[PDB]
Amino acid sequence: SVKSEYAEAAAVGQEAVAVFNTMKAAFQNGDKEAVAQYLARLASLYTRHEELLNRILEKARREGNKEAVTLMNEFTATFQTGKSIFNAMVAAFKNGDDDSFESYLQALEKVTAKGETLADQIAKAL
Ligand SMILES: O=C1CNc2ccc(C(F)(F)F)cc2N1
């Protein structure tokens, strides 16, 4: 069902949170080779999460679940803010700019926190 598809999507989201927290630790420690691999893994996970969220949104639209669609539209908007900040972070890493990186890392933590509140509401709406 769409609800089981959302539980899959949530798990992928949690995998990215885990990898993000490991990547932060490696950045603080100065292990740039590790950070590079974690960023590549995060890009894959976020791509996968987005593909699942889009399928869920489209299914809720086809099902006429207006409340779920409202909440999912808000969430995919928040997701795009994440994506933009993540790209900026990846660029800052490529450029060697640790100041921007640290900033963007903090910014992504805020996006994720707000996203999870919406994420919790979507679960109850589907
Ligand atoms: O592509 C990305 C990159 N990072 C990210 C962090 C938080 C969120 C979230 F807040 F959960 F919506 C989404 C993303 N998507």
Closest by CA to 118, choosing from 4, 2, 9, 1, is 9
Residue reference for tokens 């987005």: 50
* Cα(19) to centroid(ligand 1), Å: 13
* Cα(92) to centroid(ligand 1), Å: 17
> By the 8 A CB rule, do 54 and 9 touch?
no
> By the 8 A CB rule, do 93 and 105 touch?
no
Q: Is 115 in the pocket of ligand 1 (CB under 6 A)?
A: yes
Ligand 1 atom nearest to CA at 87:
3
* Cα(125) to centroid(ligand 1), Å: 21
Method of determination is: X-ray
Torsion angle, alpha carbons of 10, 38, 79, 113, to 10: 70
Closest by CA to 82, choosing from 124, 115, 54, is 115
